[PDB]
Amino acid sequence: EVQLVETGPGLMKTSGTLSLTCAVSGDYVNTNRRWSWVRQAPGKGLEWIGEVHQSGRTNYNPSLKSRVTISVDKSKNQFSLKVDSVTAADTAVYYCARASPLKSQRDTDLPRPSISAEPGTVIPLGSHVTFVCRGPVGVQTFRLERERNYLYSDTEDVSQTSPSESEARFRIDSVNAGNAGLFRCIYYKSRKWSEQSDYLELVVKGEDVTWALSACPQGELPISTDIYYVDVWGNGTTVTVSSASTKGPSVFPLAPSSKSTSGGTAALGCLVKDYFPEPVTVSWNSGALTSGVHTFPAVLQSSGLYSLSSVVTVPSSSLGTQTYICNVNHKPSNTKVDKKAEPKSCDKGLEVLFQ
Amino acid sequence: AIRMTQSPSSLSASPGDKVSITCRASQHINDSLAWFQQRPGKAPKLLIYGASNLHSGVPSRFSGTGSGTDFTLTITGLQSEDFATYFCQQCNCFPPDFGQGTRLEIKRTVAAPSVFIFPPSDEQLKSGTASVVCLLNNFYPREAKVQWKVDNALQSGNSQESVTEQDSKDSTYSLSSTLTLSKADYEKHKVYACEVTHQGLSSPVTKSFNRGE
């Protein structure tokens, strides 16, 4: 159904502004989801970058809040991530994700409503806040309730957003101190009132005052009673950042010391060394050699360049019977080098090295 | 933030076994946790949300339990597609941090590595560097030790390792250790030895060569 594809630079230079966009297909971005970015360094696990909300509110992991910006373009159904002033440690596979308020596939046809705040639940004094009550389809009345100094407000404007949800909005234009406290929604449908929603606290912030009742760590109150889980991941795009330039690999043979007390089986390989752009294909004898090859992952040395090895194991009698050629092509420089690996001859004597 | 700790870090099993992975949160999060599966190279996928509710389309061998601070993902009918890495994520408070993940590996009979040593090519020493490579072939499990000795002296800091993924058929691993020296340093000594200790080995296996021969 829904599909997210990430586009961005394959290789990016250090210290520059990284920009990726996510194209959403089969869903509209102007719905009640949170579009997120998540990052995975090479072999280190998941790190959450941030999210954007339908109201335009964004939230960033405080590790990178200095450098990250998330935005949405509704016209083309895309959303973008921009991270400034990149270290080499920002090299990673980046995923865009859709976080949705999944609900237990329970259905009572009279489920409990939810309440949310936009832009959030901590509002400066005098600024606006909007509550969004959401429930099932066919809701005839929505009421927003305040707990302490109990007052309530009814609204009969209700829109279908899907064949299973409906929502209603209550806007306070200039919040004062007396607006702070607990809020919850309840809806009227099928001739009876529903269960009350859970409470959401709205706090008002002033010059030197915070009007809050007295949950989560240090701050960061929830802004909805619904938990948003990421139910759709993109395949991710790998971005590499490095202070380097495209370079062809040096290829060296790993020869099995022609007589080496060798028993039944033998091994021999190719060592591809110091090539910048990550992908390199190594096939032996251009394909005719399949069973027994083992080519290892690249390793990032402080040279900023990569190096790996590819090895095959052979019958120990195959010295002269077959000549082995390893075929390494580096497409980003289109350096197609092929080198035949054979043992060194004992005729020439003793190799001497000095200076 | 809230710290999620998964247990164990790694785990070995065979197709058909029932496995359980734990995730413990630092504080109470009211079921606000999700389980994700990530196979090697591909993108993550949602298994359970709300700590116990099975996402649509994923098989029922997967199951989620727990709340408060302790949650458990269990697979009963292990199949080949389940051998992947699993992550927990807390989704209640602002930074929805993941766990460090747990990798699920195929359990296999112990197999000793076939060890080989490779001297540097003459073409490499023209550029002033020497790389000697030790290869450990088709062993299980991965926990293996490679040590370099240059004229009987144990080497440290000048070798990097790189191990393959579990192979599709034998479920074995292969390791590559590379010792990199300058041609100047390579000149100074004669005997280069790679010493490998593995549980499939009764005693450590040492393969060596003499420079120039």
Side-chain angles (χ1 to χ4, degrees):
Chain A
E1 275 186 0
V2 174
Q3 192 205 28
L4 317 186
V5 316
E6 310 87 343
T7 61
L11 162 61
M12 159 153 269
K13 187 200 279 163
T14 320
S15 292
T17 76
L18 172 72
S19 98
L20 311 159
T21 83
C22 185
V24 178
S25 160
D27 189 5
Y28 302 97
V29 289
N30 193 34
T31 176
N32 174 47
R33 328 275 201 194
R34 308 181 174 169
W35 311 93
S36 322
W37 287 88
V38 179
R39 177 170 75 169
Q40 183 175 45
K44 176 101 204 209
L46 302 181
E47 171 185 38
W48 183 84
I49 303 293
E51 59 187 29
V52 72
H53 298 175
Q54 160 160 68
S55 81
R57 184 203 167 114
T58 74
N59 266 125
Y60 312 116
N61 176 26
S63 325
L64 313 109
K65 182 226 281 143
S66 84
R67 339 207 307 273
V68 282
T69 293
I70 303 264
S71 63
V72 166
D73 177 74
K74 180 201 164 158
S75 34
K76 329 172 224 183
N77 210 46
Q78 303 168 346
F79 67 100
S80 83
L81 163 69
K82 290 238 182 195
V83 50
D84 284 324
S85 149
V86 294
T87 288
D90 303 325
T91 298
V93 49
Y94 287 66
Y95 304 95
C96 56
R98 171 182 81 139
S100 322
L102 302 195
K103 279 319 184 23
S104 35
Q105 52 284 17
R106 172 227 52 166
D107 205 37
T108 324
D109 313 349
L110 179 75
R112 207 151 78 115
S114 77
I115 179 180
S116 310
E118 294 183 350
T121 61
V122 52
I123 304 301
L125 213 162
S127 156
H128 67 90
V129 70
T130 305
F131 294 103
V132 190
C133 301
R134 295 193 239 247
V137 76
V139 163
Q140 290 158 239
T141 318
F142 254 117
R143 173 175 326 197
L144 166 79
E145 275 197 349
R146 178 196 183 40
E147 192 224 42
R148 160 191 309 226
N149 188 22
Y150 177 85
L151 279 285
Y152 67 78
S153 167
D154 283 4
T155 279
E156 305 219 341
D157 83 26
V158 177
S159 57
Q160 281 195 78
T161 45
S162 92
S164 66
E165 38 199 75
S166 55
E167 66 187 30
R169 315 183 98 82
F170 309 78
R171 181 202 185 93
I172 310 160
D173 281 288
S174 297
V175 152
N176 81 54
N179 306 126
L182 269 38
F183 290 82
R184 45 150 170 210
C185 302
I186 176 165
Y187 67 84
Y188 184 90
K189 183 215 181 177
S190 294
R191 295 182 183 174
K192 66 255 182 177
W193 284 100
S194 86
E195 218 171 325
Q196 287 111 325
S197 78
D198 269 321
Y199 282 111
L200 189 80
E201 183 194 9
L202 166 77
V203 175
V204 188
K205 263 209 135 292
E207 165 79 0
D208 213 337
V209 201
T210 324
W211 279 282
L213 87 44
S214 294
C216 276
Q218 270 208 63
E220 309 303 318
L221 286 198
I223 70 158
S224 155
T225 68
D226 283 348
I227 307 292
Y228 288 68
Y229 311 101
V230 315
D231 63 335
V232 171
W233 297 73
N235 289 337
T237 317
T238 168
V239 308
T240 320
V241 85
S242 211
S243 41
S245 49
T246 286
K247 149 151 173 30
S250 267
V251 168
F252 304 133
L254 317 166
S257 316
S258 86
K259 59 74 193 165
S260 75
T261 59
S262 64
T265 205
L268 48 70
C270 269
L271 159 78
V272 310
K273 215 208 170 217
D274 302 309
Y275 66 103
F276 169 47
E278 175 54 52
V280 165
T281 282
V282 194
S283 148
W284 291 72
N285 288 351
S286 285
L289 192 32
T290 167
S291 210
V293 76
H294 265 132
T295 169
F296 294 89
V299 152
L300 184 48
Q301 42 248 38
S302 274
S303 148
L305 293 170
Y306 300 110
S307 63
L308 62 89
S309 316
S310 179
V311 302
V312 281
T313 84
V314 286
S316 175
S317 58
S318 315
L319 207 165
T321 318
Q322 173 56 280
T323 37
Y324 302 106
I325 292 90
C326 84
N327 320 115
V328 48
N329 58 345
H330 181 232
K331 176 62 166 268
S333 179
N334 251 308
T335 325
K336 298 198 167 334
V337 162
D338 40 358
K339 192 119 50 171
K340 145 185 171 176
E342 81 257 15
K344 286 207 177 75
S345 53
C346 296
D347 303 37
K348 320 298 282 221
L350 175 61
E351 259 157 5
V352 177
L353 309 90
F354 50 101
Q355 256 298 315
Chain B
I2 309 171
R3 314 141 221 162
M4 318 295 292
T5 87
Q6 309 189 221
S7 324
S9 302
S10 96
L11 163 63
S12 65
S14 209
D17 318 325
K18 98 163 298 177
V19 313
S20 304
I21 305 145
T22 302
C23 174
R24 168 168 67 69
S26 82
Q27 32 183 278
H28 290 243
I29 58 179
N30 317 70
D31 309 33
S32 291
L33 177 137
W35 285 105
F36 297 94
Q37 164 194 83
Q38 174 168 260
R39 290 210 262 280
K42 294 200 173 177
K45 150 184 190 186
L46 180 53
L47 289 176
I48 314 114
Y49 65 92
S52 81
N53 317 301
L54 183 60
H55 189 228
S56 323
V58 301
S60 177
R61 43 190 203 265
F62 301 75
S63 100
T65 196
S67 157
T69 54
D70 304 283
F71 319 79
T72 305
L73 159 79
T74 88
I75 311 138
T76 70
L78 258 200
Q79 277 256 286
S80 316
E81 310 83 323
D82 307 12
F83 285 113
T85 303
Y86 296 82
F87 294 91
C88 67
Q89 186 200 17
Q90 84 86 7
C91 312
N92 205 345
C93 301
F94 165 45
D97 273 328
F98 297 93
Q100 74 285 349
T102 87
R103 186 181 57 95
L104 201 84
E105 162 205 51
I106 310 181
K107 170 153 290 181
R108 183 217 183 295
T109 44
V110 178
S114 317
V115 185
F116 317 85
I117 196 169
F118 289 108
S121 66
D122 273 337
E123 211 91 73
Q124 190 197 334
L125 294 137
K126 286 204 68 162
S127 52
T129 54
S131 307
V132 316
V133 179
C134 200
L135 161 59
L136 283 53
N137 210 43
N138 305 46
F139 58 93
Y140 180 93
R142 314 199 305 175
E143 283 66 36
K145 198 59 60 187
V146 316
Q147 295 180 110
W148 295 91
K149 319 293 189 71
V150 175
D151 275 356
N152 299 325
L154 185 269
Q155 304 301 280
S156 55
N158 52 358
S159 49
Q160 77 213 345
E161 282 186 357
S162 154
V163 48
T164 66
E165 302 271 32
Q166 212 167 18
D167 187 52
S168 197
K169 91 109 175 170
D170 40 352
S171 312
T172 206
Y173 299 95
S174 299
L175 192 146
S176 148
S177 179
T178 317
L179 172 88
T180 290
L181 313 148
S182 66
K183 161 189 172 180
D185 292 333
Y186 181 70
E187 281 164 7
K188 290 201 94 313
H189 315 282
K190 162 174 171 174
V191 175
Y192 291 79
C194 169
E195 177 184 292
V196 168
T197 88
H198 189 229
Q199 98 183 5
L201 296 185
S202 321
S203 303
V205 158
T206 295
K207 300 266 156 184
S208 56
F209 70 90
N210 302 343
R211 173 171 69 50
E213 311 181 7

